Ligand binder design. Structure first.
Ligand code: CL
Ligand code: CL
Ligand code: CL
Ligand code: CL
Ligand code: CL
Ligand code: CL
Lengths: 267, 266
């Protein structure tokens, strides 16, 4: 198309260049990125505001602090490519969440009520040492239980008052799940759980404070249950590849150059 | 000129170029092409595509059948590899030729200065430093014993080696230290290392036949002429210079600012 470098005789052109990086595994990620952008920018471009993109960018900075500038250059990213990738993950997210709320049927709300426990409120005791978890346990199982005290005088940190459903993100699955099975004013056992980043086995002790009735009507919890089916679909690759496989067809996307033929081998 | 199409929008090669031009991988692509074309019109007839095929076959036999997967693990193709062997040979020939031009008499003076006559010794290669001591002391009985205890002890294939101060037969340690002995005599346990593994190898050199310096140039020229080349040949700083010159002759100049300082190192 254009010229890149000149020399006596032959010269480098945008074509000669493309003919080299054309089959580059890194080029496939580029073409596929332009498709996702142009497609979702026309079908959802107005949905996600450039104001939301900023909020996410500013938070991304506040976290890495004065390391953000470095952290980016590290994994090969300019401060414009990052703020540009935050928008795409937010477009595909908006699309993945509206279509996840369309397919919802009756059988789904009924297959989501089976394995669902009502919201609970307990006194959690997080610990790093397992022998200390076995210690606070017998103190909790004494004549003067006084669990709340044992908690506030031993917890690894954070708080002691925790509220959670069955499919809610608040405590490790191990804890979250074993905790619900307990009944009104029921003390747990030493629960071993991995950490989100340090993988340092954290040991928890939970005691149910206030709990409610399981209930039997599905329409009763359509609020929680509905946002839970979306929460799962939104976290499912096969479903995300699918909503992309849809938008791409709705945009009648069709590759011309063979090199990138296997790009939509998952859409 | 277009890559993919859609409803009311199109992805042309222009959009793509404006996406990966500032990429680090793309900077290498421009350079590789710029390097090839220049060394092709200036030294293409010097490197025969028949000489590249032999160099390629050597790589194959070495990696054996795993050559296919090996290239895949490095991201190379089975043509891009052979393609790289050519540019790796064009530049190599330019360095040898270019380095064999500004050769001055003073260059031969600084070469004969620290040079030493070619010597032949009955070397011994060992794994553990422990036996490296055992073989030495048992070699200190009558003297001529070292001969037989050098055949059934050396971990290497041959014992007789022919080297000077510019060869790369034995390690630099076991090389220079082996040129500090007399016409005859053994040496101390030289602690060296392997190229493939880091395993420390312990050598024991024994001079058998030596020559002597002739305090002259041509007395040792074809050797002091190859050493200067092999030195500028392995000097990255000088290698950059030849590229800087080839590019200077082809009057090379970039037009897109997206690849401005790609020759700042050249
Ligand atoms: Cl829609
Ligand atoms: Cl609190
Ligand atoms: Cl249960
Ligand atoms: Cl002089
Ligand atoms: Cl004998
Ligand atoms: Cl031999």
């Amino acid at each position: 198309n254009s010229k890149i470098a000149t020399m006596k005789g032959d010269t480098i052109t945008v074509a000669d260049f493309y003919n080299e990086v054309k089959n580059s595994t890194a080029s496939k990620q580029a073409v596929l990125s332009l498709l996702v952008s142009k497609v979702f920018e026309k079908q959802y471009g107005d949905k996600v505001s450039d104001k939301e993109v900023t909020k996410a960018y500013n938070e991304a900075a506040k976290y890495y602090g004065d390391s953000f500038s470095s952290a980016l250059a590290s994994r090969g990213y300019t401060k414009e490519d990052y703020k540009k990738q935050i928008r795409s993950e937010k477009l595909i997210e908006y699309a993945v969440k509206e279509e996840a709320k369309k397919e919802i049927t009756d059988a789904s709300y009924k297959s989501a009520y089976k394995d669902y426990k009502p919201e609970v409120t307990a006194q959690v005791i997080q610990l790093d040492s397992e022998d200390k978890a076995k210690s606070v346990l017998e103190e909790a199982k004494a004549d003067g239980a006084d669990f709340a005290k044992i908690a506030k005088d031993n917890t690894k940190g954070d708080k002691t008052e925790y509220s959670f459903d069955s499919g809610s993100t608040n405590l490790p699955s191990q804890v979250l799940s074993a905790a619900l099975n307990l009944d009104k004013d029921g003390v747990s056992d030493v629960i071993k759980a991995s950490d989100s980043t340090t993988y340092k086995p954290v040991y928890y002790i939970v005691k149910i404070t206030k709990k409610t009735d399981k209930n039997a009507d599905w329409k009763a919890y359509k609020k929680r249950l509905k946002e839970i089916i979306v929460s799962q679909k939104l976290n499912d690759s096969n479903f995300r590849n699918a909503v992309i496989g849809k938008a791409f067809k709705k945009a009648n996307v069709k590759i011309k150059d063979k090199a990138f033929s296997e790009i939509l081998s998952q859409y």
